[PDB]
Amino acid sequence: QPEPDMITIFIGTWNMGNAPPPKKITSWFLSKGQGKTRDDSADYIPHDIYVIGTQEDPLSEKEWLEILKHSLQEITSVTFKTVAIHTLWNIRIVVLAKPEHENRISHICTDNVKTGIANTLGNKGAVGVSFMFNGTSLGFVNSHLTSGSEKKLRRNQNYMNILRFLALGDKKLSPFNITHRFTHLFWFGDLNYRVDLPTWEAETIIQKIKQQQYADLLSHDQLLTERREQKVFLHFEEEEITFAPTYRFERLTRDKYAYTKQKATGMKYNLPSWCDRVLWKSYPLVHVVCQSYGSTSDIMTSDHSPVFATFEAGVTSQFVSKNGPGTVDSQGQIEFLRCYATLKTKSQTKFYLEFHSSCLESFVKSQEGENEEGSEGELVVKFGETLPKLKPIISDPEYLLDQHILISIKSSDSDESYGEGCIALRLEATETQLPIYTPLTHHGELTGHFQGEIKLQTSQ
Ligand SMILES: Fc1cccc(CNCc2ccco2)c1
């Protein structure tokens, strides 16, 4: 039975409003309702992996797992296996997989991050899961960020704390946060970004929503505008939103948005908003395609509607050769030539690189670079042809061209990373000098660039 080179992944996010779900929630897992929806002809085809994020979830883990598994069994006639479940307060993630994948999944990690201090610590944060699916690392984050139209900056801060402190994936990737540890990272939840229009415009916004005219609302969505200004979710993707705002509804119908200030809201307005979102970040030149992104119309127990997204995701096999794993294959080499980092830092330490990849036996430290001044004020660190030749474990081009090199530039004085990035080995040619590029980030914010040329030798 052949190992897959593609899987499909379902991502759900639902803020349950502290209420038990209705009897039937199958529309969620079927990607049916508003937005980019799934074709009826696929309804019996199971996704390979289902990842369910809830917020304000009132159920026990046992109670929710019985509902989820019985829902999927009814849709697909498949009894899913539980990969992982993790709950922080009322924020939960469940990962379910088809039984045929049980042998393919390993290295399962879970973690959480509590956001805020004192006042602001006690209910917001994130939970996450990671695992290996054959040769492909997968990460999932469900976050419930700070509420309130006025608190977009707090939400951005919550995002940076979560990516800094959530400990998922391979701990040997010490310089790298979750935004570099995974082939595919999905980040979803009640992100709580709002449509930033005046309170007086509430009824006008509702009118627009009834006409299905979302353009002048989306132009004011705080997540889209903060992303466009590079304040949050740098280098993540989101499918276009084509569904109505998913918050704040009167319960037991979807006919009414309940936006007016009440004692129960702390006297805050909740204008209709796309609080509930799915974003992703995949390594360069890996197949990832969003095949649905939408909200259900028939699950009405909460003041939010559930959101679904589905993806095709490229995966690779657990490769064995006569040589690696367990040794190098000397018919393989990676050379980084005429490379230089451009850094936004004002420090004047010397810098070295680290190259990390599961195609290497262990990470490789470079010699220090040569620092020069950039013409517009910046530090340029030149590496020349000084960089160590990387010795992959397997030389077969069917393996090596699917790999990635993580790069960290580190201070010689402190050993702290000043920037992290990723280079694909999915080259147009082998045995040929080709341009390479990655932005460099630290704590998820842009700190520089790394560029130069690569020369890849495979056994072919
Ligand atoms: F999908 C899953 C659901 C539950 C557990 C696991 C872990 N399976 C580990 C393993 C054994 C042999 C090869 O891989 C996977």
Swiss-Prot record:
It is found in: Cytoplasm; Cell membrane; Membrane raft; Cytoplasm, Cytoskeleton. Specifically expressed in immune and hematopoietic cells. Expressed in bone marrow and blood cells. Levels vary considerably within this compartment. Present in at least 74% of immature CD34+ cells, whereas within the more mature population of CD33+ cells, it is present in only 10% of cells. Present in the majority of T-cells, while it is present in a minority of B-cells (at protein level). Changing V288E: In one patient with acute myeloid leukemya; somatic mutation. Tyrosine phosphorylated by the members of the SRC family after exposure to a diverse array of extracellular stimuli such as cytokines, growth factors, antibodies, chemokines, integrin ligands and hypertonic and oxidative stress. Phosphorylated upon IgG receptor FCGR2B-binding. The SH2 domain interacts with tyrosine phosphorylated forms of proteins such as SHC1 or PTPN11/SHP-2. It competes with that of GRB2 for binding to phosphorylated SHC1 to inhibit the Ras pathway. It is also required for tyrosine phosphorylation. The NPXY sequence motif found in many tyrosine-phosphorylated proteins is required for the specific binding of the PID domain. Phosphatidylinositol (PtdIns) phosphatase that specifically hydrolyzes the 5-phosphate of phosphatidylinositol-3,4,5-trisphosphate (PtdIns(3,4,5)P3) to produce PtdIns(3,4)P2, thereby negatively regulating the PI3K (phosphoinositide 3-kinase) pathways. Able also to hydrolyzes the 5-phosphate of phosphatidylinositol-4,5-bisphosphate (PtdIns(4,5)P3) and inositol 1,3,4,5-tetrakisphosphate. Acts as a negative regulator of B-cell antigen receptor signaling. Interacts with tyrosine phosphorylated form of SHC1. Interacts with tyrosine phosphorylated form of DOK1. Interacts with tyrosine phosphorylated form of DOK3. Interacts with tyrosine phosphorylated form of SLAMF1/CD150. Interacts with PTPN11 in response to IL-3. Interacts with receptor EPOR. Interacts with receptors MS4A2/FCER1B and FCER1G. Interacts with receptors FCGR2B and FCGR3. Interacts with receptor FCGR2A, leading to regulate gene expression during the phagocytic process. Interacts with GRB2. Interacts with PLCG1. Interacts with tyrosine kinases SRC and TEC. Interacts with c-Met/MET. Belongs to the inositol 1,4,5-trisphosphate 5-phosphatase family. This is Phosphatidylinositol 3,4,5-trisphosphate 5-phosphatase 1. The gene is INPP5D.
